[PDB]
Structure 1
């Protein structure tokens, strides 16, 4: 209900009859987001007028995040809005502050422009000396967020930052380290010197500093393992009380570095699984993966981690079903309940899984005994038949192998898979075996298909071992190939690795020997 004065002001704002500056629209939007008494968000004819007022105003007065907030509060209602792009300063508008603001505007409002980045960099170089120490760190952070490829300027900035080592604090040092590690093309000399500086001032570090340093070392790689050593020694006296995210980062760095002093690994994992219940979904997934990769999943380890992950198992993200599914394999521990809940969740989201994820899930469930008697096999078969157009060779091989191992019988799907695999040739034997496995379930195929299959398998018989030779022979006999060049090629290899025939020789091989 709008009284007379309120209604008249609403009408005046509705008719675009009032000139609004950026500050006033920001204040009104803040009031609306804070309090909903007058129903500002419930009048489309009012927020539409406010949006029209916002478009035709000078947005350069307010800070970048204020413009981003107005855009977000208009997007939430249902109006597609985007703050205007800032122009590069020209002539005397040149200053360090405006050149930082251009990057900040491009960062916050999600409007990345490589041409404007290049223009700004080509104009900030001469005055690099005038820059203050904090502005250098801000520029490094902004360039790291924008994924700029101009590693030379970032290196120059990093050198000028190192020249003021005394001025900078622990937080600035950590921010510079991580922002340098994120740039791909940075020279390794500057990286070595920056990690050397991080190596000292080690006791001053805070949990945020520890997280930044561990992120940088995970990004960098084994080449800096030595520095990481002094980190794990440094935290050996605080390990009994650390944040769960810090211990997860420690496990990730342990897995990446291929650390080999096992006592530190065991102590840190033991400290982690005490407070593992505080981890988010993503961090829990990565703790599980890192622990698996280090060969540390004992019985209690796996039990505790599975109990912690079963909570998020109800609403798992699609990207997180496959990794835990893999971890549940390759371990001799009971994980029936986790498997069942994960399979149910996988069934729930069968219409949003990409081709690669569907192939991975079918591969992981291929040999699972309790996965045959489930609706997932049929649902995933239909989904794979639909998605065969979007599947690469690896995804095709994975899905077809998983379906063949699961007992799914559908001749049309296997014929279509064989055609799609004939579109792009099979590079490896592992990429071709699933097609044979699928086609051998029914036991028949058109003669042209078996001829093309024989033509493909014939060159690959030169390098496969005896077991592969036997499997290929079995599949070819099941399909019914008559081509002689194949059988001849398979025969020769057999002889080379087995000299001449013998009564002892297996009958099938002896037949294979006859080049039927």
Structure 2
């Protein structure tokens, strides 16, 4: 490959004038096909990164820059896309400050001074926003964990004003983003929940998930909306996804639902399809079932069997909850308990102070843990960690 070798050499020596779009195209073909030794060759990738760092990245989308950075990081080159400045006085438009926020969110590099600057250039021109632009900027501000509640409240009032121009997904996303904001007012939240429950007959499972997350974040002050959604979703309980059933369980635990008639139906529906849950969802379902006092003789066995296939590679932060659930429940969990102790013995090196303390506390009164070899290892590790406890 004389021509290919010459092209690679000219790219390595930084003698080719590359545009951002050309670097993006090269990254895409290297990450997709990779028939050539592009990613395996370090010098060519270093030269491409040097060309990309000095290029003009304004002519590419935030997603494209993120993909370029991800491709560079996959091989070892520590790459980070440039930070875009706030638009000048002429380019101050509702569609450009939203772009600034979107790039800040996508590239995972947030500057609070820039957030304040683009929040002070949005108020005078806030009357030029499209109905969907408000629902976009609300979620963008929520995802940046901004503490400005007055701006979000004004945005929510405007979103309420253009109710008829928004789809169900926009309403649900606005509701959940509003619920995530800590300092927002409660009258706005009540109005938004009324709006959601008025347009609640068109919800897709994604909108159900968003509404359930919003309710769980808000707390037991909004029982009526949860009661309405429980009464509505009773028709769909059998034909329902597992994740939204787990979210129903979490909301049931949070609100302290005293109507224990539908709880049985939803719990049975969840335990029927519990086989299709990941680590976090299964752990949350376990906690919600325990806090609702639902662990029976048979469903506990099925959930434990589901946990068995996950207990080998559980995260260190998901071992203590299952141990606590097994401890409180009076049923048989010896096999699961032994597997969890083995996993904890494996993870003793990376366990933090709090997780190690919880693991030791749950196994304080456990008879089989007396002779298990975790005692000496955990004692030595606790002696080492005693400075951080």
Interval of TM-score (by shorter of Structure 1 and Structure 2): over 0.9
Residue 323 of structure 2 aligns to a residue whose secondary structure is: helix
Unaligned runs of 5+ in 1: 390-516
Instruction: Please state how far the C-alpha of 1:96 moved relative to its aligned partner.
Output: 1.2
Shift of 1:142: 0.4
CA distance in 2, matches of 1:215, 1:374: 41
Measure how far apart 1:94 and its partner are.
1.0
Residue equivalent to 2:16? 18
Per-residue deviation, 1:232: 0.2
Question: Post-superposition, which runs of at least 4 consecutive aligned residues in structure 1 deviate over 4 A?
Answer: none
How far is the alpha carbon of 1:179 from its aligned partner?
0.5
Cα offset for 1:214?
0.3
1:299-448 aligned within 5 A: 299-389=297-387
**Displacement, 1:335?**
0.5
Distance (Å, rounded) in 1 between the aligned partners of 2:313 and 2:119: 45
User: Which SS does the other structure have where 1:60 is aligned?
Assistant: helix
Deviation at 1:74, TM superposition (A): 0.1
Could you report, residue by residue, the CA deviation over 1:263-298 in whole angstroms, capped at 9, with x for unpaired residues? Answer: 011111011100000111110011011000000101
Q: Secondary structure at the match of 2:121?
A: helix
CA offsets 1:19-47 (integer angstroms, 9 cap, x no match): 11110000000000011111100111100
How far is 1:98 from its partner? 1.1
**Paired position in structure 1 for 2:147:** 149
**TM-score normalised by the chain length of structure 2:** 0.99
SS for the counterpart of 1:228 is: helix
Residue 134 of structure 1: CA displacement? Answer: 1.2
SS at match of 2:128: coil
CA drift at 1:97? 1.3
2:183 aligned partner: 185
Quote the offset at 1:199 in angstroms.
1.0
3-state DSSP of counterpart to 1:338: helix
Measure, in 1, the Cα distance between the counterparts of 2:19 and 2:35. Answer: 24
Task: Provide the TM-score with structure 1 as the length reference.
Answer: 0.75
SS of the residue aligned with 1:237? coil
Using the alignment, how far apart are the partners of 2:3 and 2:270 within structure 1?
Answer: 62
- Equivalent of 1:115, from 97, 113, 116? 113
Offset at residue 4 of structure 1 (A): 1.1
Secondary structure of residue in 2 paired with 1:94:
coil
Q: CA RMSD in A?
A: 0.6
Counterpart Cα distance in 2 of 1:201 and 1:121: 30
Mapped to 2, the partners of 1:135 and 1:86 lie a distance apart of 20
Matched residue, 2:205 = 207
- Structure 2 CA distance, aligned partners of 1:148 and 1:175? 16
Distance 2:234 2:93 in 1: 47
Give me the whole-angstrom Cα distance separating, in 1, the residues matched to 2:97 and 2:225. 35
What does residue 419 of structure 1 align with?
none
Within 2, Cα distance between the matches of 1:334 and 1:94?
Answer: 65
**1:230, CA displacement in angstroms?**
0.3
Deviation, 1:90, is 1.2
Counterpart selection for 1:89 from 87, 96, 105: 87
Per the TM alignment, residue 384 of structure 1 is displaced from its structure 2 partner at its CA by: 0.5
| Helix, strand or coil at the partner of 2:83 | coil
Partner SS for 1:162:
helix
Alignment counterpart, residue 253 of structure 1, candidates 241, 251, 254: 251
Specify which structure has the bigger relative contact order, considering alpha-carbon pairs within 8 angstroms and separated by 6 or more residues: 2
Please report how far the alpha carbon of residue 251 of structure 1 lies from its aligned counterpart in structure 2 after TM superposition: 0.1
Secondary structure at 1:203's aligned position in 2? helix
Aligned length, in residue pairs: 387
For residues 312-355 of structure 1, the C-alpha deviation after alignment (integer angstroms, 9 at most, x for no partner) is 01111111100000000111101100000000000001100000
Mapped partners of 2:227, 2:37: distance in 1: 59
Instruction: Please give the alpha-carbon distance, in whole angstroms, between the structure 1 residues aligned to 2:333 and 2:12.
Output: 61
| Mapped partners of 1:185, 1:281: distance in 2 | 32
How far the C-alpha of 1:203 sits from its partner, in A, is 1.1
Distance 1:319 1:339 in 2: 16
SS of structure 1 residue aligned to 2:166: coil
Shift of 1:107: 0.4
Q: What secondary structure sits across from 1:93 in the alignment?
A: coil
Secondary structure, counterpart of 2:165 in structure 1: coil
Question: Aligned with 1:157: secondary structure?
Answer: helix
Shift of 1:53: 0.3
Q: Distance in 1 between matches of 2:299 and 2:7?
A: 65
Distance 1:326 1:265 in 2: 23
Q: CA deviation at 1:187?
A: 0.3
Deviation (angstroms), 1:206: 0.8
In the alignment, the residues of structure 1 paired with residue 291 and residue 175 of structure 2 have an alpha-carbon distance, to the nearest angstrom, of 27
Alpha-carbon offset, residue 360 of structure 1: 0.3
Q: Tell me, what secondary structure is at the counterpart of 1:91?
A: coil
Cα distance, 1:243 vs structure 2 = 0.2
DSSP 3-state at the match of 2:127: coil
User: Displacement, 1:153?
Assistant: 0.2
Q: In 2, distance between residues paired with 1:331 and 1:46?
A: 59
Specify every segment of 5 or more residues in structure 2 that has no aligned partner in the other structure, as ranges: none
Query: SS in structure 1 opposite 2:26?
Result: helix
- Structure 2 CA distance for aligned equivalents of residues 36 and 203 of structure 1: 48
- After TM superposition, give the deviation of residue 201 of structure 1 in Å: 1.4
